[PDB]
Amino acid sequence: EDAELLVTVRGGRLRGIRLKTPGGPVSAFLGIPFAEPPMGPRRFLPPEPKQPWSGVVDATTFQSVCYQYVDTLYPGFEGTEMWNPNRELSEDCLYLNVWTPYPRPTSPTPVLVWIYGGGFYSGASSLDVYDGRFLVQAERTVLVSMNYRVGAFGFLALPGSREAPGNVGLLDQRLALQWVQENVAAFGGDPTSVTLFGESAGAASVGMHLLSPPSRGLFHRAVLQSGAPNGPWATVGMGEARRRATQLAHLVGCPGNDTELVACLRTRPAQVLVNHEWHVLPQESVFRFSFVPVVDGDFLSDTPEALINAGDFHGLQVLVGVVKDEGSYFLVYGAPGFSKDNESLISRAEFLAGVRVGVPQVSDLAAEAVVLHYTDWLHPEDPARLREALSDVVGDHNVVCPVAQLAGRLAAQGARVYAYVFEHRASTLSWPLWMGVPHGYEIEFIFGIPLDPSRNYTAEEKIFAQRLMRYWANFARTGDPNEPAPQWPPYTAGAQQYVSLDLRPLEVRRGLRAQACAFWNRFLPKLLSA
Amino acid sequence: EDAELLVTVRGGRLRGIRLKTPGGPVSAFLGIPFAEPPMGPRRFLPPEPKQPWSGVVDATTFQSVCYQYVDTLYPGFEGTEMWNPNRELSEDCLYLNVWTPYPRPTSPTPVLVWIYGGGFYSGASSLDVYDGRFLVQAERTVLVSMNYRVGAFGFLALPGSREAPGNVGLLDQRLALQWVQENVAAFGGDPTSVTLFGESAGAASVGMHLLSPPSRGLFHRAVLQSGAPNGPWATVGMGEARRRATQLAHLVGCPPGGNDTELVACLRTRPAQVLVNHEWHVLPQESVFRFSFVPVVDGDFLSDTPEALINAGDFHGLQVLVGVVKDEGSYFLVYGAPGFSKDNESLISRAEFLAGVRVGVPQVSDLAAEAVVLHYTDWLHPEDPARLREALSDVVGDHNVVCPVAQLAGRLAAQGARVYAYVFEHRASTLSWPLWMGVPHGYEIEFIFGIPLDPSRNYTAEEKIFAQRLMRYWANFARTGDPNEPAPQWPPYTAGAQQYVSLDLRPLEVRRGLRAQACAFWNRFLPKLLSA
Numbered sequence A: 001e002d003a004e005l006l007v008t009v010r011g012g013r014l015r016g017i018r019l020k021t022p023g024g025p026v027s028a029f030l031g032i033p034f035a036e037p038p039m040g041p042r043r044f045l046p047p048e049p050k051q052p053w054s055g056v057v058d059a060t061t062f063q064s065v066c067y068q069y070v071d072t073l074y075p076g077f078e079g080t081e082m083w084n085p086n087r088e089l090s091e092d093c094l095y096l097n098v099w100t101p102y103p104r105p106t107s108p109t110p111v112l113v114w115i116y117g118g119g120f121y122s123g124a125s126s127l128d129v130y131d132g133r134f135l136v137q138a139e140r141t142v143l144v145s146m147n148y149r150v151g152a153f154g155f156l157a158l159p160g161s162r163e164a165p166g167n168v169g170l171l172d173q174r175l176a177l178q179w180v181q182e183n184v185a186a187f188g189g190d191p192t193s194v195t196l197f198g199e200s201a202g203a204a205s206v207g208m209h210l211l212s213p214p215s216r217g218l219f220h221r222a223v224l225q226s227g228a229p230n231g232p233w234a235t236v237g238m239g240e241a242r243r244r245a246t247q248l249a250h251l252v253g254c255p256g257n258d259t260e261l262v263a264c265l266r267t268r269p270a271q272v273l274v275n276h277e278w279h280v281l282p283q284e285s286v287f288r289f290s291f292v293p294v295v296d297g298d299f300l301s302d303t304p305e306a307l308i309n310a311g312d313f314h315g316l317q318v319l320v321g322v323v324k325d326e327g328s329y330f331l332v333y334g335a336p337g338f339s340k341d342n343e344s345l346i347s348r349a350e351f352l353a354g355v356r357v358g359v360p361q362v363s364d365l366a367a368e369a370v371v372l373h374y375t376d377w378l379h380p381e382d383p384a385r386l387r388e389a390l391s392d393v394v395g396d397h398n399v400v401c402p403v404a405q406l407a408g409r410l411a412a413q414g415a416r417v418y419a420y421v422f423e424h425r426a427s428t429l430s431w432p433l434w435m436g437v438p439h440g441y442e443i444e445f446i447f448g449i450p451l452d453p454s455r456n457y458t459a460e461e462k463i464f465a466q467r468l469m470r471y472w473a474n475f476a477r478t479g480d481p482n483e484p485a486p487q488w489p490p491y492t493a494g495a496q497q498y499v500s501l502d503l504r505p506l507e508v509r510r511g512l513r514a515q516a517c518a519f520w521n522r523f524l525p526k527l528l529s530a
Numbered sequence B: 001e002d003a004e005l006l007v008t009v010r011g012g013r014l015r016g017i018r019l020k021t022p023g024g025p026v027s028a029f030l031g032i033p034f035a036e037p038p039m040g041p042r043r044f045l046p047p048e049p050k051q052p053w054s055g056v057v058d059a060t061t062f063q064s065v066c067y068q069y070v071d072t073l074y075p076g077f078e079g080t081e082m083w084n085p086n087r088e089l090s091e092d093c094l095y096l097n098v099w100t101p102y103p104r105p106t107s108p109t110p111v112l113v114w115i116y117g118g119g120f121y122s123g124a125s126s127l128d129v130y131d132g133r134f135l136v137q138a139e140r141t142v143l144v145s146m147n148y149r150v151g152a153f154g155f156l157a158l159p160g161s162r163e164a165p166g167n168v169g170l171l172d173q174r175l176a177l178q179w180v181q182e183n184v185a186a187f188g189g190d191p192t193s194v195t196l197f198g199e200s201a202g203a204a205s206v207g208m209h210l211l212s213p214p215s216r217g218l219f220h221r222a223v224l225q226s227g228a229p230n231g232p233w234a235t236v237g238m239g240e241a242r243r244r245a246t247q248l249a250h251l252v253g254c255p256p257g258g259n260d261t262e263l264v265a266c267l268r269t270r271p272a273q274v275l276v277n278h279e280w281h282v283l284p285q286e287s288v289f290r291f292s293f294v295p296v297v298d299g300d301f302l303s304d305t306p307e308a309l310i311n312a313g314d315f316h317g318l319q320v321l322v323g324v325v326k327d328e329g330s331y332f333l334v335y336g337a338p339g340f341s342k343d344n345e346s347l348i349s350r351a352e353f354l355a356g357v358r359v360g361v362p363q364v365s366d367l368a369a370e371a372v373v374l375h376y377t378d379w380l381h382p383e384d385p386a387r388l389r390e391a392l393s394d395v396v397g398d399h400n401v402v403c404p405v406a407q408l409a410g411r412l413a414a415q416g417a418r419v420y421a422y423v424f425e426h427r428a429s430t431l432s433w434p435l436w437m438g439v440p441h442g443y444e445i446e447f448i449f450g451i452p453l454d455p456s457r458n459y460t461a462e463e464k465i466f467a468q469r470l471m472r473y474w475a476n477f478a479r480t481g482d483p484n485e486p487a488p489q490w491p492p493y494t495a496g497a498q499q500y501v502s503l504d505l506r507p508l509e510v511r512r513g514l515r516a517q518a519c520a521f522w523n524r525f526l527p528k529l530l531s532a
């Protein structure tokens, strides 16, 4: 056997696999159990640390995906199948993965921990797009990713209960972070240089660990890609969380005691809760999710907006960014007149219809302030302009402006922030041309998927991916993506400087849609209060 | 005696003068009485028609300026004194002027009737810049202008009362319009072709005559320059009018509210200047672009608000010419907005801009002010003083002039009226206001009346050709309802294309949208914030 693939963690012995990379081998330890399987009476409960095992646990392949809905809108279409589970579904799913150089490092090595996205209802660490073998080989870091419970299994909350306290999917992430602190040194990783990074709902989780003191001491830097904890979709109140948990019970035949309600829920097969989790949303919507983190005073002592405005973020370096067309992807999932199979040139009626879907559960006055700001009153009915306006509505409201608010507040309160806009449309992109650079399609370049020989990325895209991996690893090692060439300046509340990321050199620009985000971040909150 | 200077109207015989212009002689009849003097017991009452007279009335000079406030912020400064009264102040002031070609026309000639502006508190038809001699000589028109009561004398309203019904200054104008229908043919004018045109409050007055049926039958075409009846300043509610009238009476010592008859009768014993000295103490807030006594929406002269009448109106068979200047709001900022002055560049701070917004947009909720800050702030340069100065100028201009004018033009075109729109973009070479004000409110007038043709003033030769271009524009509209001749063409304004033309020394240039993005906010969104 091989000594490099044998590691002993505090729980027992593991056997890993040697992986092939176009630049040499890497060692991967996949499917490491970090928690007791949260099945049966442990459904909805906080994770328990994995009990010690005797013998060798086989860490040779990815474990099962946590139970989740599977998207069926475009069956077989690459653009949506790449996000779908590529492993068997199971509630026995609390495993993590470690990628390290081969041979393992002698000196402590910076550690990158990845939290996947998926609207808190889906996602898996085993997706081909999250393959950490290229990043580890190219940049000589230790890569860790974990599975956490999603949907009702991870975020069903009966606030004040103890059988369903909520946020346990976030506690899965924290437990894995505690696992890293206790065991990453056995792989050559440095537990004193842990950099969290995630995308979409994973970026929102990254932000929530920043604002929760128990998790704050488990990492040192953070990267938030196209997501933020202050997003209108990322958290839910205690009252609404209880309403949604109660109606899911009614939708599946349960039962009144919180104790009895969760007891009856625990008898239902996991696939049953998945089939009814979406029917508890209050209205027809794009970009809203049933079971999300809950603000209950525990994991989050206040709303993410409150904790951001009140925090002291000196000594923290963060890397945040968005893609160019954040809203395009979500429109084909309910916005009237939208489909990937044509140009979705909508009418004024569909535009106004789509505004109520992209900005749900707001007053009529609030809805038409949106229509006022996103209408070009010299071309109020131009179909092409309306298509891009509605995508701007969805993208600004849900991603770009929550991220811009977080960058501005953190920068003004001690943190050193670096901001980017990802503007490269991959040559392999199967989505229609009118979507531009859709949400989530910067990930494959960050993980260096273009260097896979199996794929048809071009030579310039391969160099671009190596640039991006160098930016991300530089930040993980020092909190500065620059190398001591065009320089990436920190984002500040005043200058609001950010960089373009594409095949061209770095271009410095001002304003993460400052005009549009002044409406979302400054004016409309005052409109809803009065 | 000269037969061409003698005219007989229904009230008696008149004697005018032969005016010399650069182009030739004009016959002017200045100071024709059209109403009984609204003095003593007639103060605050609708005008009575002037009773017939024996002998010849010498209509040979401008009569008195109706009692009003006299501006004093920049004493002796030409830019402000041009608007101040150039005759003695009097309550005996209901006179109109008529200019006509020399010799009198042989056939009926179209008539242009002028209504001056001045925030319903000032103004006079005798001002040098309303000299109708150049228009008549250059375009062979009959031009009529009248005086009307302003301030409390013209628009103090105790709604429902018979002794102070309000809107009597408007009835002064309507009475003059009835005078034109009965007497303009004696001067060679065509009563079947009467074009009303005014500016600022006079433009708001022109609009209110379109929306009042008793007035609508007295003319056929309208021109509104930098004003509209639907502006937030042009009318007031019956309840606020009563409060403003009561508190003015209280400030001058009447009664020593209660009975309306007793209240007004006490007010009628107060000297005219005393009422003027307290007129501005009744305003609810410190503001620019708000005036104490203006038309009232009482259900009589205006059955409903001008916005309601504009929306529910059928305007087929009506031709309207509308427009504004390039920088409508800059003039008003030197009259209260913190940090502003004509004597420096008025580069204001962020706090001065925020403070200036509530002065320019008075009595709106704090939520409403925030919306204004949001739309007029450039969030990449939120504290640039030069940008902040222009933004406050646009705030006051759009809210008070441009946006209301644009709402009127759009609703009229959509509802059957032929509309033409302009933006006056020429800054006169003789302008005494500082440059940062650009083309200020009310400085297109001197070109419309052809003042550059006056040999005693130093306009350039290009500005004299420009004035002759605009005079033909206005006269072509008055004659035909179309400013075109039949040369670059001036297309009609429509709710969709929103086409207008620029009026400068260069030829015509078609553009789209009268600050559409900005005005959408004033005309579409903000009304419903105020509702909820």
Ligand SMILES: *[C@@H]1O[C@H](CO[C@@H]2O[C@@H](C)[C@@H](O)[C@@H](O)[C@@H]2O)[C@@H](O[C@@H]2O[C@H](CO)[C@@H](O)[C@H](O)[C@H]2NC(C)=O)[C@H](O)[C@H]1NC(C)=O
Residues within 6 Å of the ligand: A334, A335, A336, A337, A338, A339, A341, A342, A343, A344, A345
């Ligand atoms: C572009 O397509 C959308 C989506 O319609 C679906 O996809 C098409 C490719 C075709 O297969 C249709 O039969 C599918 O229904 C059209 O959007 C409309 O969408 C609403 C609800 O989202 C639906 O009720 C309408 O029937 C759709 N309109 C149709 C089918 O004409 C959109 O109209 C297409 N754009 C065009 C034709 O310009």
Ligand SMILES: *[C@@H]1O[C@H](CO[C@@H]2O[C@@H](C)[C@@H](O)[C@@H](O)[C@@H]2O)[C@@H](O[C@@H]2O[C@H](CO)[C@@H](O)[C@H](O)[C@H]2NC(C)=O)[C@H](O)[C@H]1NC(C)=O
Residues within 6 Å of the ligand: B259, B260, B261, B262
């Ligand atoms: C409001 O007052 C008018 C007028 O009052 C007159 O003059 C006052 C100074 C008082 O002292 C009395 O001399 C008068 O009454 C009232 O209208 C008058 O009504 C009376 C008889 O009804 C008549 O002799 C007067 O000529 C009227 N004067 C007018 C019409 O101008 C009116 O009734 C009073 N209103 C109320 C509610 O009492």
Ligand SMILES: *[C@@H]1O[C@H](CO[C@@H]2O[C@@H](C)[C@@H](O)[C@@H](O)[C@@H]2O)[C@@H](O[C@@H]2O[C@H](CO)[C@@H](O)[C@H](O)[C@H]2NC(C)=O)[C@H](O)[C@H]1NC(C)=O
Residues within 6 Å of the ligand: B336, B337, B338, B339, B340, B341, B343, B344, B345, B346, B347
């Ligand atoms: C620009 O001028 C304004 C107006 O001030 C008046 O006009 C000036 C030309 C000068 O003659 C001043 O003395 C006049 O009072 C200035 O705003 C005023 O500033 C002074 C103090 O400098 C203050 O006492 C007044 O209250 C201010 N008035 C208002 C209406 O705000 C402004 O500061 C000048 N800009 C500069 C100096 O940069």
Ligand SMILES: NC(=O)c1cc[n+](COC[n+]2ccccc2/C=N/O)cc1
Residues within 6 Å of the ligand: A069, A071, A121, A274, A275, A276, A277, A278, A279, A285, A286, A287, A288, A330, A333, A334
């Ligand atoms: N459990 C479910 O029924 C269920 C249904 C739908 N979704 C997610 O919806 C599909 N979707 C997937 C990706 C992006 C958007 C959307 C929908 N937008 O309205 C999750 C669970």
Ligand SMILES: NC(=O)c1cc[n+](COC[n+]2ccccc2/C=N/O)cc1
Residues within 6 Å of the ligand: B069, B071, B121, B276, B277, B278, B279, B280, B281, B287, B288, B289, B290, B332, B335, B336
């Ligand atoms: N009766 C008065 O005291 C009085 C005072 C001031 N004004 C006019 O004030 C100057 N002014 C001049 C031009 C434009 C606006 C303004 C005022 N806006 O509040 C009229 C009457």
Ligand SMILES: *[C@@H]1O[C@H](CO)[C@@H](O)[C@H](O)[C@H]1NC(C)=O
Residues within 6 Å of the ligand: A454, A455, A456
């Ligand atoms: C690369 O292109 C070939 C063209 O024949 C195609 O068959 C193959 O699937 C492509 N590889 C991808 C899409 O990864």
Ligand SMILES: *[C@@H]1O[C@H](CO)[C@@H](O)[C@H](O)[C@H]1NC(C)=O
Residues within 6 Å of the ligand: B456, B457, B458
């Ligand atoms: C025109 O300019 C001349 C040149 O000094 C001057 O005498 C005259 O008064 C000016 N006319 C005006 C200011 O109206």
Ligand SMILES: *[P@](=O)(/N=C(\C)N(CC)CC)OCC
Residues within 6 Å of the ligand: B083, B116, B117, B118, B119, B120, B123, B199, B200, B201, B202, B233, B289, B331, B441, B442
């Ligand atoms: P407008 O009636 N007119 C003004 C200010 N003016 C012309 C006489 C002076 C330039 O006032 C705002 C309604």
Ligand SMILES: CCO[P@@H](=O)/N=C(\C)N(CC)CC
Residues within 6 Å of the ligand: A083, A116, A117, A118, A119, A120, A123, A199, A200, A201, A202, A227, A233, A329, A439, A440
């Ligand atoms: C906040 C909702 O968006 P995120 O959870 N991420 C998504 C939807 N994807 C799919 C493209 C990347 C994993």
